[PDB]
């Protein structure tokens, strides 16, 4: 299918957008985000509508759509 574009918002209000397929495991997004922030992945928690995103959550499981937001907080 098509990529959807998600906005990942940091604690400092910075944004990195990610294109993922509906079947992508979101661990891949978490890894890339942590890499680009220069911090360990396990130091961060990733929330969708306030709910914790699991490594093996997919956008399809979470009901995500184009331009949905992920928030990142410290673990």
């Amino acid at each position: 299918g098509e990529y959807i574009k998600l906005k990942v918002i940091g604690q400092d209000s910075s944004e990195i957008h990610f294109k993922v397929k509906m079947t992508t495991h979101l661990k891949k997004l978490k890894e890339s985000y942590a890499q680009r922030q220069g911090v360990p992945m396990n130091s961060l928690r990733f929330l969708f509508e306030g709910q914790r995103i699991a490594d093996n959550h997919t956008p399809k499981e979470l009901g995500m759509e184009e331009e949905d937001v992920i928030e990142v907080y410290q673990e």
Partner: peptide, 15 residues
């Protein structure tokens, strides 16, 4: 800040 969009995408082995 500029926009940032990241795309999340054996027999040859020698080790």
């Amino acid at each position: 800040a500029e926009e940032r969009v990241v795309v999340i995408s054996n027999s040859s082995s020698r080790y």
